[model samples]
Target: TVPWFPKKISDLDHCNVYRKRRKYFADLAMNYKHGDPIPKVEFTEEEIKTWGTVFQELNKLYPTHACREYLKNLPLLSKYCGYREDNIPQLEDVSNFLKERTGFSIRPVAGYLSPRDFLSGLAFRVFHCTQYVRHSSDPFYTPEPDTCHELLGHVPLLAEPSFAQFSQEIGLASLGASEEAVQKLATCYFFTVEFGLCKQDGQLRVFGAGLLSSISELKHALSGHAKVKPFDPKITCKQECLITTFQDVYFVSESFEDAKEKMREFTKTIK
Candidate 1:
């Protein structure tokens, strides 16, 4: 593995995969060092097609399936970063939009990043996002964070202050912690940040990036199929982490601040 990319995976690492996507676009942004001005770029036909259809499909479901915080903040990312039905938003644009909104900037990675590398960025309000789309053949089944998954699923929630800070707390906990500590903290993060849910108007709503990004998971999780429980970090940190298939159960938060407080308290227990 190259210095920019790591091959090994830890228990908490989610970006672990063998066939990484074409990272030229993200590498382009990585060309300029951090704090240096990033250059603008365009998406290819392959990239656009890979992204466009998925974006349109997700936009359709997001209206009803996603929580109020995600629904309210999504348009803001669209307005600033060109998150539309027909095109793929550039990494540079997403980065700048996040910087302005939540002080959360997108840092492009070549391929998979270790949990420590990925989450530590969040301590400073930076999200190490990938810049590739899944093959058009299987858009809905990407195991990693594809364009649709990151931008549509995770990015919008970062624009919300409470969730954004909660993300940072996860990052803050990962920094310099023991492997056991990170594993426990990351287990909490995996359940909450990746596949967590919430209640709104007497119904379960999707909030986690893994759920928000996949149209299929939203249907399965929110449609009275999967077991949904209240957010409990101690139980959450103890639950088995997901490997490939959909999570059998999901944890729910009453609000973003509610999720934030739970995680913030858990982070304190790590040290």
Candidate 2:
């Protein structure tokens, strides 16, 4: 699972006083209900340009590295929500698309959340997302999750039916599970949803949001050196959260269909 961001302005690079100041405006833009219109950011030239740089780079990899579902529906996202190299897509468009397609929708949260709050939203099939851009100096890197990660890495898969169920199953299981159990469950989530992979056409392809959003990690996740494995609850729950550096390992699914079957079985066992 993605870390519950503290929603701290401190997370941004210090040079961006404007970014910090405007965060209040960004937070205001995030307030909405399921049917309410998603507020627009009318992102600054710098912010949209930051998005452009990331879109240009990540799109280059999509032609080959990204999975079939992600590749196929990407244009829909671009057309419907403006996932172009020039602008960030509106949440209203992204949310509306997912709501109709997969019973999934996006919600904007004021800041980061606890595992309880963040994971709980999943039961309703809503992904509480962050709405900020990283400092533009570094194109592919961000200290905390920005729009690039949520929109680029996570959103496309929500358009797919099987992947939507896979995500919702994890959310459904989190309900009423103990804190200790949820912590372990979060560990499982860290490996699978945040950094998961799939074996495709004899090669490992990305489905995880973290690796999906990172050009470097996306490259490294499939590198011959990374330790990729079959999905297993026992083994995955034992793996610690690995957000700061290159992940030590990753879990692989044979197919998205198989992943749901296995994840539902695994979710049944979460205490």
Candidate 3:
């Protein structure tokens, strides 16, 4: 294994075959360096099927549930990234589009990243993304974040300038931040970037990547089962976040631009 490759997987639920696939993809990601084309994955039939299932199902709900910014950019992804059912888009294709629009580019990662490292990338307008797909047994659920989550849940919003600026603001705040500040910033990121909501014409829309990627999450977020509150980084940073289950609380902003303005002020207090 490469020195940068993770050495442990005792806790992951993948079978041996899936595990081997993980290492192969991980190696591909590690071999890549900045300025080179992002490594490509020739997804297996099963992997394509998994992406297809997610792509087809999520498209149905997005028209009604997703934010306007997301709706506006998804077709652009289709035009540039090969974002269609029965096909898995490459990281290079998606990264190029984002770079052209918002100065945000995607870099493939072997797997999960610490909050500090992950947030720091956003400071530079780089999003570290996972290259592998989730286990084939359940396309709807995965114990870990995967390419499906990154591509479907997160990428579209990165193409929107207002939202992109907002995302970078949170990332910039994390630079050289104290440990306590990092935790708070990560919590702020979780509630906003991962599971955030916004009001559009008086109706709540899904913008957070976590909610946008998962049908269950999108339904539960809008179903009133979760507590929805106004977005304020001062309050949002202090709130607890959930990764394994649906969030119990959500923060809604008037708009992505509004959130950027709020974040602009809030980030100042971090340093």
Task: Please give the CA lDDT of all the candidate structures.
Answer: 0.75, 0.75, 0.83
Off by over 4 Å in 1: 1-32
In model 2, which regions exceed 4 Å deviation? 1-16, 29-35
> Whole-model lDDT, candidate 3?
0.83
Candidate 1 TM-score versus the reference: 0.86
Candidate maximizing TM-score: 3
List clash counts for every candidate, in order.
Answer: 0, 3, 0
lDDT of 2 at 179: 78
Which pairs of residues collide in candidate 1? none
Give TM per candidate: 0.86, 0.88, 0.92
The positional error of residue 125 in candidate 1, measured at the CA in angstroms, is: 0.4
Instruction: Tell how far residue 176 is off in model 3, in angstroms.
Output: 0.7
TM-score order of candidates, top first: 3, 2, 1
Residues 1-271, model 1: lDDT tens digits: 1123223222122232313336465556457456655555566677787777777778888888888989998887778888787777777788777778888877666566667777767777877676667777877767767767788878888888888888888877777778777788778778878898888888778888988877678678878878877888877888888758889789988887887787778777766
Q: Whole-model lDDT, candidate 1? A: 0.75
Candidate 3 stretches with Cα past 4 Å from truth are 1-15
Error (Å) of candidate 1 at residue 270 is 2.6
